[PDB]
Amino acid sequence: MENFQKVEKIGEGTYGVVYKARNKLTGEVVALKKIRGVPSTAIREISLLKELNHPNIVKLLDVIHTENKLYLVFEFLHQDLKKFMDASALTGIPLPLIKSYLFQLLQGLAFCHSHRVLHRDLKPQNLLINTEGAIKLADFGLARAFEVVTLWYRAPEILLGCKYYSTAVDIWSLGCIFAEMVTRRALFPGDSEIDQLFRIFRTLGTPDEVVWPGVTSMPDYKPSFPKWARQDFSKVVPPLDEDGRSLLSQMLHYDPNKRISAKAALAHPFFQDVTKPVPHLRL
Template sequence: MDKYEKLEKVGEGTYGKVYKAMEKASGKLVALKKTRLEMDEEGIPPTALREISLLQMLSHSLYVVRLLCVEHVLQSTDSISPSPAVSPSPKSNLYLVFEYLDTDLKKFIDSHRKGQNPRPLDPSLIQRFMFQLCKGVAHCHSHGVLHRDLKPQNLLLDKDKGILKIADLGLGRAFTVPLKSYTHEIVTLWYRAPEVLLGSTHYSTGVDIWSVGCIFAEMVRRQALFPGDSEFQQLLHIFRLLGTPTEHQWPGVTSLRDWHVYPKWEPQNLARSVPSLSPEGVDLLSQMLKYDPAERISAKSALDHPYFDSLDKSQF
């Protein structure tokens, strides 16, 4: 790790610390993600290696944060090693070296909501960010990878170029997602699909599409669409707006593990929650927030939705 000069800690991700650093040789800024790995007898666990090679492949998309390289740092154990029978497993850190981007969509939305100059996000900017987000998600899904934790904090922005990139991708399986991050902030539920909240163990690409819909609405509203602070409250937020789901609408919903009998709410008019959004935008949003995951629009189909008709797609 002598190649890098750590400049500051920029966060504690779900899997470990994240540093802003400079590559000494080139002067280029990078983000270093330090992940603790439990080594097994053969070294790095194969699950982790698979995840990393997947990340490297996915990051060839412009809309996924680029993984530049991986550095494996083995911490030296005592020089006088005990008998092999009781040798401690070596401590090992894996540093994932990513391109560095200085802001994320959450900070960007916050800057439009608070501060000296609160103002809505430009509708054409929302459209551009949405197109890039759907492109990035479609790219992941086409390689069989679910993100499972899409939220504005995980969408990094290159403000000068107007590019949005998906971050924190794909480590979910090898490093098992903890429910709390290291800083003990509760992992947010605001973007979590109802099938996950209801304890479904079989879920698919629809979980990411639901999150994309929530992010879409949040860019328009400048505040979260479903800001629940527990799984139960999260479901109630969703049911109050979209109506309590029925077996007719979503076959199998009442057999999900955490289903209870909920108050029966009627669906509200979605357009009222996003008053400044065009009718085409409201239509796309409603197709992302369908209860039955099988009915949600795919990321690839979303790219052809009329909401994007006025966009010059050749630039992407």
């Protein structure tokens, strides 16, 4: 913490505050994260993430454990997807770029998932982009090792009390982000766990044993939940073509076991014509 000249506070996260900082030694600019004695288990878990390198994952540079304090040093990126989406609010993000970012994110998740590492809290603020047209996932693996908290991207099984969620929860969140980029409106903007759940039910229909075997036996499932019918996807995400809609529906299946995997999603027809355009960024 003495070797860094904190520039600005980049924002608070689920596990701590992140600052843009300059390494007094190397002179390099990095993202410094102060985790909110430090469990040895976490120490070892973190060290593991340090050897998890991939083009679409924010690189963990150093783990500083001193004075019973824990700081993580990450590579610094140009902007986050939420800020980019806001700046593109009036015209929306061009489809070629949306398709490019989704393709890369799926590559990143396929990599994490193959190493059995889940995110569990994907959201646009956690996705970082640079001037080169790349996009990377931040916070990967911190959930395992370690007021107004956004619930918009949380999978149904987590809201229903399932304690052993799988990699499928990340696919759900990505599905929600995908729809948001296309329509420019959050898909399920709930303000509470039950409101979130009901917004999901009102759009995709109240789940039952037919579409999701075992759902009525979930810890927080109530037989008294209202019975809403499923809406047409053409209504939910109007501007998306049929290949896009078919992919999205597979990412938003209620049953975690039927939900498409990142690996299989990479082979979907939607990515047939994928390219890598450069975004116009205002830094």
